[PDB]
Amino acid sequence: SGFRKMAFPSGKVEGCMVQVTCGTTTLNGLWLDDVVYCPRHVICTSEDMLNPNYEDLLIRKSNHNFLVQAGNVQLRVIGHSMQNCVLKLKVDTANPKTPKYKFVRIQPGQTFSVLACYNGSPSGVYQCAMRPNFTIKGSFLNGSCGSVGFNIDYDCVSFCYMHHMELPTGVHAGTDLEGNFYGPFVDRQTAQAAGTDTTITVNVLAWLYAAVINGDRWFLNRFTTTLNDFNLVAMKYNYEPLTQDHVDILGPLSAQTGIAVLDMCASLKELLQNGMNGRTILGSALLEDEFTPFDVVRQCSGVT
Amino acid sequence: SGFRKMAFPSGKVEGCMVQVTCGTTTLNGLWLDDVVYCPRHVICTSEDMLNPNYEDLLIRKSNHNFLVQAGNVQLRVIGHSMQNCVLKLKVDTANPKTPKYKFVRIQPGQTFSVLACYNGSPSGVYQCAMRPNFTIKGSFLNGSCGSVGFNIDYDCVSFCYMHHMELPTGVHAGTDLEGNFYGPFVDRQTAQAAGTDTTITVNVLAWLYAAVINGDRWFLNRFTTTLNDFNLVAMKYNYEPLTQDHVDILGPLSAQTGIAVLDMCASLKELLQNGMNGRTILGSALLEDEFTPFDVVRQCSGVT
Ligand SMILES: *[C@](O)(C(=O)NC)[C@H](C[C@@H]1CCNC1=O)NC(=O)[C@@H]1[C@@H]2[C@H](CN1C(=O)[C@@H](NC(=O)NC(C)(C)C)C(C)(C)C)C2(C)C
Ligand SMILES: *[C@](O)(C(=O)NC)[C@H](C[C@@H]1CCNC1=O)NC(=O)[C@@H]1[C@@H]2[C@H](CN1C(=O)[C@@H](NC(=O)NC(C)(C)C)C(C)(C)C)C2(C)C
Ligand code: NA
Ligand code: NA
Numbered sequence: 001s002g003f004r005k006m007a008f009p010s011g012k013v014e015g016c017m018v019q020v021t022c023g024t025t026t027l028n029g030l031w032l033d034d035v036v037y038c039p040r041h042v043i044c045t046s047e048d049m050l051n052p053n054y055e056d057l058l059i060r061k062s063n064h065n066f067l068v069q070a071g072n073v074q075l076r077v078i079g080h081s082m083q084n085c086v087l088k089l090k091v092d093t094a095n096p097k098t099p100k101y102k103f104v105r106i107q108p109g110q111t112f113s114v115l116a117c118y119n120g121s122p123s124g125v126y127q128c129a130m131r132p133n134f135t136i137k138g139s140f141l142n143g144s145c146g147s148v149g150f151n152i153d154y155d156c157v158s159f160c161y162m163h164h165m166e167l168p169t170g171v172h173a174g175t176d177l178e179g180n181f182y183g184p185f186v187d188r189q190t191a192q193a194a195g196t197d198t199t200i201t202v203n204v205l206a207w208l209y210a211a212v213i214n215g216d217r218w219f220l221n222r223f224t225t226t227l228n229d230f231n232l233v234a235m236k237y238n239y240e241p242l243t244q245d246h247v248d249i250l251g252p253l254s255a256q257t258g259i260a261v262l263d264m265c266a267s268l269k270e271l272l273q274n275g276m277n278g279r280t281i282l283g284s285a286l287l288e289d290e291f292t293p294f295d296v297v298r299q300c301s302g303v304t
Numbered sequence: 305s306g307f308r309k310m311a312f313p314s315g316k317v318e319g320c321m322v323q324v325t326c327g328t329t330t331l332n333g334l335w336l337d338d339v340v341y342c343p344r345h346v347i348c349t350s351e352d353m354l355n356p357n358y359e360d361l362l363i364r365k366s367n368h369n370f371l372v373q374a375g376n377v378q379l380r381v382i383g384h385s386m387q388n389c390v391l392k393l394k395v396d397t398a399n400p401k402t403p404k405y406k407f408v409r410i411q412p413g414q415t416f417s418v419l420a421c422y423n424g425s426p427s428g429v430y431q432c433a434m435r436p437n438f439t440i441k442g443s444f445l446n447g448s449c450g451s452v453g454f455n456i457d458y459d460c461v462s463f464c465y466m467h468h469m470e471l472p473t474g475v476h477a478g479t480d481l482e483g484n485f486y487g488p489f490v491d492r493q494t495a496q497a498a499g500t501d502t503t504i505t506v507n508v509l510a511w512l513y514a515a516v517i518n519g520d521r522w523f524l525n526r527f528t529t530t531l532n533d534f535n536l537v538a539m540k541y542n543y544e545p546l547t548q549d550h551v552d553i554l555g556p557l558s559a560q561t562g563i564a565v566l567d568m569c570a571s572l573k574e575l576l577q578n579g580m581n582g583r584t585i586l587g588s589a590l591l592e593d594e595f596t597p598f599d600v601v602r603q604c605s606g607v608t
Contacts, residue, residue: 006430
């Protein structure tokens, strides 16, 4: 028993992290096969950042402008390309440590693990979720750009995030590895705001299943509810709506604990209106919405 | 900006994790050089656990009783030894992936990263601290035994914890890699209780420095305090006492933010007496004591 914010092992992704320098601007790229993926604003200067025309900045750039450093080796760049907001530096040499990998664009609510890098070197690993506003609450300093979010399906590293931007609040924005931004954000240093940040209800419900399973049970209560009437209440507290899919998803946990989702909804409903009255659940004083139904199943069945 | 519970990269330690089976009982061992370290209760059956005489259980055991499995290889065991509560299986082959390593016994308050394993396979990584009662609040299921806690000093993996036991509460106990238990715990399934779990004050003070640095500043206040008078108050809320060493330790953060420790103590003092009044600090509704002064410096300077 016990329940933690737990990242996948970083080891397989560690092998893929390289430094990418362009003039002054230096940051992290991801090396899979004979291609290094990095944010395209590696090309920009501090001033260029204010309003870049990348197309235009790319004209005065050749393969040899791009310093791909793998720890203390230099990969030869034999091609560069722009795919939405990432550069794809074709290098002579395939990453020998390339894992089985996919690029997936996550939906909001899905969680993934961040391997935070500086100078193309892992500093730390942590979990987080794609909020519904399409930000994440990372920890990221200058030089973190091109650090990646991943999940692992046993053998296979699924890459979902490349880190580009911080927004006032210390929330973060970035791209899939196809370089399409999550949410309405652009790689410019112009005004642009996150929308309302909603709570991921299905994730909060899974957390409570995770709570129950560990023997924190007190929030449980006599009442049941309907999807519709729980939403009437949720909406107000800025919770993502719940759906039959969310319910089907939670089934495993429902089956594990013998507590129908709709019962757990009633339990969660009261906590929304009455708060936690000083108590914790799994040593959290607030309702934790950064666990997928899978995160709990993973951690409470203990899959590897 | 942004601040997370962030584990070191697991990759270097991943290489060291092997399955160890003895009859029925199967769990994780750590493979460095020609030695595999595991909990000694690999030898016990379910019944033996109730009150084992290891010395005595070790008599009816030979090298060949111990199945050291490295993914899908079998390491030959050419020697076994008992060091307090760990076995040391001498094998023919040195782990080629052995990192630069040390074994350190941490003091309580120090944090380290857990790489949670089943069948000698990394399932997940998370940070935690050695509470002052000498428990940790892991997440650990049956098969997790012999999973290790580590820190990294740039090149060098420092191993501080091997996981043995869960206690009612879902708190956990275990050993240094010399197999001496942290705290008064024994590898028997007998009654034995954790002491009072105290809050790690120096760690809470660092968290607030971490808060300040990210622009959560509101808890800051007009008052200063003395070490003595803050303790008079702390004691009551079950906070670890503060010392001149704790103050010298926090200096870097004090210097970073221009806020004397004793000021931060006054700020923390009021929050102890008045609570947080619904507000969060770094999106935590309670005072987080699972960050070393180094954890913040690491994450907020961004060392690798
Ligand atoms: C990134 O380039 C890097 O790590 N290498 C230098 C960097 C990461 C960033 C630094 C602080 N925290 C982080 O996550 N990202 C940037 O420098 C991006 C680049 C240039 C500015 N910028 C920002 O993130 C800026 N944010 C905003 O401009 N904010 C709004 C869009 C809401 C205004 C700063 C102010 C520097 C954080 C672009 C976005 C291409
Ligand atoms: C470990 O052996 C393993 O993972 N491989 C089988 C296992 C880890 C444990 C299972 C549930 N959560 C965990 O962290 N540890 C044990 O089985 C240890 C072994 C045998 C019993 N035991 C316990 O942890 C038991 N706890 C207690 O006995 N509790 C007190 C000492 C306070 C009574 C259980 C009840 C099984 C959790 C010894 C301690 C050698
Ligand atoms: Na970009
Ligand atoms: Na033991």
